[PDB]
Amino acid sequence: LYSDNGVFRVTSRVMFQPRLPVLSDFVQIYNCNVTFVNISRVELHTVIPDYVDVNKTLQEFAQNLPKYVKPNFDLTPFNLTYLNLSSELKQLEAKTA
Amino acid sequence: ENQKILAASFNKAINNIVASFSSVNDAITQTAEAIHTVTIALNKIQDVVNQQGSALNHLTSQLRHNFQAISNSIQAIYDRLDSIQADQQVDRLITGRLAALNAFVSQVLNKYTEVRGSRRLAQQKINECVKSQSNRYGFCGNGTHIFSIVNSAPDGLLFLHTVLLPTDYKNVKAWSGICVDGIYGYVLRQPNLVLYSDNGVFRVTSRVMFQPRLPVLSDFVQIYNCNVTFVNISRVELHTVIPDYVDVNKTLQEFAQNLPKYVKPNFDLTPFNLTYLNLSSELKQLEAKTA
Ligand SMILES: *[C@@H]1O[C@H](CO)[C@@H](O[C@@H]2O[C@H](CO)[C@@H](O[C@@H]3O[C@H](CO[C@H]4O[C@H](CO)[C@@H](O)[C@H](O[C@@H]5O[C@H](CO)[C@@H](O[C@@H]6O[C@H](CO)[C@H](O[C@@H]7O[C@H](CO)[C@@H](O[C@@H]8O[C@H](CO)[C@H](O)[C@H](O)[C@H]8O)[C@H](O)[C@H]7NC(C)=O)[C@H](O)[C@H]6O)[C@H](O)[C@H]5NC(C)=O)[C@@H]4O)[C@@H](O)[C@H](O[C@H]4O[C@H](CO)[C@@H](O)[C@H](O[C@@H]5O[C@H](CO)[C@@H](O[C@@H]6O[C@H](CO[C@@H]7O[C@@H](C)[C@@H](O)[C@@H](O)[C@@H]7O)[C@H](O)[C@H](O)[C@H]6O)[C@H](O)[C@H]5NC(C)=O)[C@@H]4O)[C@@H]3O)[C@H](O)[C@H]2NC(C)=O)[C@H](O)[C@H]1NC(C)=O
Ligand SMILES: *[C@@H]1O[C@H](CO)[C@@H](O[C@@H]2O[C@H](CO)[C@@H](O[C@@H]3O[C@H](CO[C@H]4O[C@H](CO)[C@@H](O)[C@H](O[C@@H]5O[C@H](CO)[C@@H](O[C@@H]6O[C@H](CO)[C@H](O[C@@H]7O[C@H](CO)[C@@H](O[C@@H]8O[C@H](CO)[C@H](O)[C@H](O)[C@H]8O)[C@H](O)[C@H]7NC(C)=O)[C@H](O)[C@H]6O)[C@H](O)[C@H]5NC(C)=O)[C@@H]4O)[C@@H](O)[C@H](O[C@H]4O[C@H](CO)[C@@H](O)[C@H](O[C@@H]5O[C@H](CO)[C@@H](O[C@@H]6O[C@H](CO[C@@H]7O[C@@H](C)[C@@H](O)[C@@H](O)[C@@H]7O)[C@H](O)[C@H](O)[C@H]6O)[C@H](O)[C@H]5NC(C)=O)[C@@H]4O)[C@@H]3O)[C@H](O)[C@H]2NC(C)=O)[C@H](O)[C@H]1NC(C)=O
Ligand SMILES: *[C@@H]1O[C@H](CO)[C@@H](O[C@@H]2O[C@H](CO)[C@@H](O[C@@H]3O[C@H](CO[C@H]4O[C@H](CO[C@H]5O[C@H](CO)[C@@H](O)[C@H](O)[C@@H]5O)[C@@H](O)[C@H](O[C@H]5O[C@H](CO)[C@@H](O)[C@H](O)[C@@H]5O)[C@@H]4O)[C@@H](O)[C@H](O[C@H]4O[C@H](CO)[C@@H](O)[C@H](O)[C@@H]4O)[C@@H]3O)[C@H](O)[C@H]2NC(C)=O)[C@H](O)[C@H]1NC(C)=O
Ligand SMILES: *[C@@H]1O[C@H](CO)[C@@H](O[C@@H]2O[C@H](CO)[C@@H](O[C@@H]3O[C@H](CO[C@H]4O[C@H](CO[C@H]5O[C@H](CO)[C@@H](O)[C@H](O)[C@@H]5O)[C@@H](O)[C@H](O[C@H]5O[C@H](CO)[C@@H](O)[C@H](O)[C@@H]5O)[C@@H]4O)[C@@H](O)[C@H](O[C@H]4O[C@H](CO)[C@@H](O)[C@H](O)[C@@H]4O)[C@@H]3O)[C@H](O)[C@H]2NC(C)=O)[C@H](O)[C@H]1NC(C)=O
Ligand SMILES: *[C@@H]1O[C@H](CO)[C@@H](O[C@@H]2O[C@H](CO)[C@@H](O[C@@H]3O[C@H](CO[C@H]4O[C@H](CO[C@H]5O[C@H](CO)[C@@H](O)[C@H](O)[C@@H]5O)[C@@H](O[C@H]5O[C@H](CO)[C@@H](O)[C@H](O)[C@@H]5O)[C@H](O)[C@@H]4O)[C@@H](O[C@H]4O[C@H](CO)[C@@H](O)[C@H](O)[C@@H]4O)[C@H](O)[C@@H]3O)[C@H](O)[C@H]2NC(C)=O)[C@H](O)[C@H]1NC(C)=O
Ligand SMILES: *[C@@H]1O[C@H](CO)[C@@H](O[C@@H]2O[C@H](CO)[C@@H](O[C@@H]3O[C@H](CO[C@H]4O[C@H](CO[C@H]5O[C@H](CO)[C@@H](O)[C@H](O)[C@@H]5O)[C@@H](O[C@H]5O[C@H](CO)[C@@H](O)[C@H](O)[C@@H]5O)[C@H](O)[C@@H]4O)[C@@H](O[C@H]4O[C@H](CO)[C@@H](O)[C@H](O)[C@@H]4O)[C@H](O)[C@@H]3O)[C@H](O)[C@H]2NC(C)=O)[C@H](O)[C@H]1NC(C)=O
């Protein structure tokens, strides 16, 4: 595994045949010897393409019970809930009068 | 299912060899070519004994040749001449017989040298075919090795290799890779797998035996720029050749406006419905109260 001027590639040790790394070439070697590459999980896709965090994406923007159908992010056809109760109080005052 | 036929084909092979050792030769020469090896194995064992016998038969036969003396028996030489004249005759036989012994010793010493060179091969075969199942071609058995059995013989060992031989073949429509969208291409990583497709379904097998199974995403690398003799397929239908593969981000775009399709949410249930209708509900309440 090697990196030139910001891009990572994987080649053999006998010939020089570069290509792109894939997730199917890595195992988990926990406790991280010191002379490794320091990188956070939010930016792992910049060294290993075809890899995305399956649950973090739904934690970010998959928020409502369905994703939507329901008034959701800047939906124009829908209108304002919880914007008639002040008028309800005013009309309750009028009704009491 | 292979072990049901292998036992039946091995038990007959054992019986054929044990019958071939029983000197009944010409009756079973029509059966197969298993005789081709047993005849050589028997001839070698016969020769290794005949050669040993002949060496001593030649050594013991050189006492008959009287050298330039009166006779070949010393008791006769000492019976005719006196003591001062028999010493010039006895040494003529002594010198010949000593030279006869020397040539025999020089041959036995050469004979021992070949055996130590032959023992290295015997040890190497024991180390490689009896305990390890070596994979070098043309080594024990001409086919694919499985195991071996050892037995003793006159001052030697006799091996029993066990190999496999193909009988029937199958025709397979091969391919060379998958090229999606004309630029991204996938090929099999290990060079011992064949990607093939019969009447609309794709499977992956080996190149030595025929063991089909289903392809998985863990067997493909990215081989960008798509040699021409590939399989033309778009990314929207990649799951029909590689199961257990779905696009993670495109489904996010599609499954988003399309959740009401699968599966349909319940109507009139919070918080899917009944928004923007509460201003109308307040208006109706006011109208009813006023009336
Ligand atoms: C991808 O992605 C996805 C999505 O995202 C995912 O999924 C998911 O996710 C999520 C996220 O969010 C997650 O979650 C997470 O988690 C994490 C982890 O966790 C951890 O922890 C937890 C807790 O801690 C736990 O649970 C878990 O586990 C557990 O553990 C445990 C232990 O600890 C165990 O056991 C348990 O225990 C308990 C206790 O102990 C109990 O038991 C007990 O015991 C005892 C003894 O021991 C006993 O005895 C007793 O004792 C006592 C003393 O102590 C006395 O004495 C008595 O007498 C006696 O008796 C007892 O008995 C017992 N009990 C019983 C009942 O029995 C229990 O039971 C047990 O069970 C368990 O088992 C376990 N489990 C299992 C299952 O295993 C773990 O460990 C976490 O961490 C997180 O969180 C965090 O973060 C966040 C952010 O993010 C933050 O925020 C948090 O904080 C928070 O904050 C808030 C504010 O805002 C708060 O709230 C508050 O609250 C309060 C309350 O308080 C308390 O409580 C209650 C209950 C009551 O009590 C009251 O009174 C008091 O006060 C208030 O309310 C206020 O107002 C509010 O505001 C909170 O709190 C906080 N928190 C805390 C904790 O604190 C944090 O920081 C999160 O949550 C999940 O998980 C997931 N899922 C799953 C399934 O997993 C996924 O996963 C992903 N994936 C991947 C691969 O990645
Ligand atoms: C999965 O999945 C997921 C989900 O889907 C994803 O995620 C996401 O996704 C998404 C999707 O949607 C995506 O997106 C996409 O993307 C694609 C690609 O992209 C591309 O392109 C873009 C743009 O073009 C970009 O951005 C990127 O990158 C970039 O690049 C660049 C280059 O180009 C760079 O740089 C930059 O540049 C710029 C410019 O140039 C700037 O700079 C500058 O420079 C200059 C020079 O050079 C300078 O100087 C200047 O100059 C001038 C001249 O020129 C003058 O002279 C001056 O004086 C001077 O000074 C300056 O200075 C500068 N500036 C500054 C400020 O400084 C900047 O800055 C820079 O930066 C960069 O860097 C980059 N970036 C990075 C980060 O790297 C790439 O390239 C695309 O393509 C797409 O789109 C497409 O498609 C669609 C559909 O699909 C369509 O629709 C589109 O079209 C559109 O349409 C619309 C309509 O409907 C439109 O709208 C419109 O608009 C308009 C406006 O216009 C304009 O603008 C504004 C601003 C203003 O200006 C105004 O005024 C004007 O007019 C209006 O408004 C109207 O009304 C409307 O309607 C639009 O526009 C269109 N578009 C266009 C473009 O046009 C298309 O066709 C999409 O978007 C994303 O991306 C994602 N994410 C991520 C993260 O990636 C994921 O991814 C997935 N995954 C997988 C694995 O697959
Ligand atoms: C990925 O990231 C992680 C975490 O960020 C990182 O993990 C640690 O990385 C460090 C550094 O690579 C490892 O080594 C540590 O180094 C510490 C030294 O830093 C201090 O000393 C500097 C000068 O010391 C040198 O020179 C003197 C002679 O003058 C010599 O005796 C020393 O041995 C040494 O050679 C000094 O310049 C430095 O100051 C920094 O900050 C100032 C600003 O404040 C800046 O101006 C300077 O330019 C400089 O950047 C600093 O003061 C050392 O202290 C540390 O020791 C710890 O551990 C030992 C036990 O081993 C404890 O006994 C000790 O008390 C300390 O707690 C340690 O040796 C370190 O081993 C890594 N691991 C851990 C767990 O910390 C990875 O390396 C990164 N991976 C990459 C980059 O690939
Ligand atoms: C996956 O899909 C991609 C893209 O769809 C595909 O990539 C290209 O595929 C083509 C075809 O396999 C590759 O070869 C090209 O073929 C073109 C020939 O088509 C024209 O000529 C036909 C007759 O020519 C033959 O016969 C004459 C003698 O008569 C002989 O001299 C020729 O050499 C040739 O053998 C003709 O029948 C055909 O007409 C079609 O369309 C009509 C309808 O209009 C229909 O009725 C016919 O039945 C027929 O289907 C057509 O007119 C050829 O022109 C082309 O050349 C281009 O490239 C060269 C440079 O190499 C340029 O110099 C030239 O100007 C052209 O631009 C090319 O040779 C082609 O190489 C592939 N790649 C690219 C980048 O195009 C993959 O093959 C697909 N993979 C699969 C299927 O596995
Ligand atoms: C369906 O749901 C909708 C939302 O979910 C809901 O829409 C909202 O309706 C409310 C009323 O019921 C609106 O509140 C009013 O706001 C008036 C302010 O209007 C001034 O700004 C307009 C532009 O607004 C844009 O900018 C502001 C920031 O300033 C921003 O917050 C907005 O989101 C907008 O981006 C001016 O409109 C002009 O410009 C737009 C383009 O931007 C043109 O399209 C117009 O044609 C027009 O040219 C407007 O002229 C005003 O300048 C409040 O009016 C104030 O100002 C007048 C003077 O003009 C005073 O006399 C008033 O006393 C008051 O101070 C008004 O009182 C009220 O608060 C709310 O803005 C709407 N939201 C959106 C996003 O549109 C629908 O009502 C709902 N449908 C139903 C049937 O209920
Ligand atoms: C709770 O939330 C739900 C969302 O999860 C919501 O369901 C959907 O709401 C949308 C808006 O609120 C609806 O969109 C509207 O569609 C109108 C067009 O309707 C025409 O087709 C109807 C039949 O629909 C079926 O066929 C279409 C394909 O053609 C298919 O997409 C649908 O899913 C349906 O299968 C016609 O209804 C007729 O037939 C049904 C039986 O099928 C009868 O019960 C009816 O009484 C009626 O006879 C209807 O008449 C239309 O022909 C949009 O209308 C536009 O187009 C017409 C021309 O067709 C114009 O005249 C209009 O002016 C306008 O331009 C309308 O604007 C809106 O977009 C969507 O249909 C809902 N889906 C379902 C499955 O119901 C619930 O409504 C919501 N409930 C509450 C109480 O809030």
Residue numbers in the entry:
A (entry chain C): 1164 to 1260
B (entry chain A): 970 to 1260
Reproduce passages from the article:
The coronavirus surface is studded with spikes that initiate infection by binding to specific cellular receptor(s) leading to membrane fusion and viral entry. Each trimeric spike has a globular crown and a thin stalk anchored to the viral envelope. Each S protomer consists of a N-terminal S1 subunit and a C-terminal S2 subunit. For HCoV-NL63, the S1 subunit is made up of 5 smaller subdomains: 0, A, B, C and D, with domain B acting as the receptor binding domain (RBD) for ACE2.
In the current study we used cryoET and subtomogram averaging to determine the structures of the full-length S ectodomain on virions. Subtomogram averaging analysis of these spikes with imposed C3 symmetry produced an average at 6.9 Å resolution for the crown and lower resolution ~11Å for the upper part of the stalk. To further assess any conformational variability within the S crown, we applied focused classification on both the RBD region and domain 0 region of the three S protomers within each trimeric spike. This analysis confirmed that all three S protomers in a spike are in the pre-fusion, “closed” conformation with all RBDs lying down and no “upward” conformation of domain 0 was detected. Of the 36 on the crown, 29 are predominantly high-mannose glycans (>80%), consistent with reported N-linked glycan profile on HCoV-NL63 S ectodomain produced in Drosophila S2 cells. Spike crowns could be tilted up to 80° relative to the stalk, with a median tilt of 41.6 ± 15°. The averages reveal the significant conformational variability of the trimeric spike through tilting and rotation that are mediated primarily by a large hinge localized to an upper region of the stalk ~100 Å away from the viral envelope. From our simulation results, we determined that most of the bending was localized to the disordered region (residues 1226–1245) separating the two coiled-coil motifs of the stalk. In our stalk model, N-linked glycans at N1242 and N1247 sit between the upper short coiled-coil and lower long coiled-coil and likely contribute to the blob-like density at the bending hinges in spike subtomogram averages. Simulations with the N1242 glycan removed alone bent at comparable angles (Δgly1242 peaks at 20°–25°), which are smaller relative to those with the N1247 glycan removed alone (Δgly1247 peaks at 40°–45°). Removal of N1242 glycan alone or both N1242 and N1247 glycans reduced HCoV-NL63 S mediated infection by ~70% at three different MOIs, in contrast to the negligible effect of removing N1247 glycan alone.
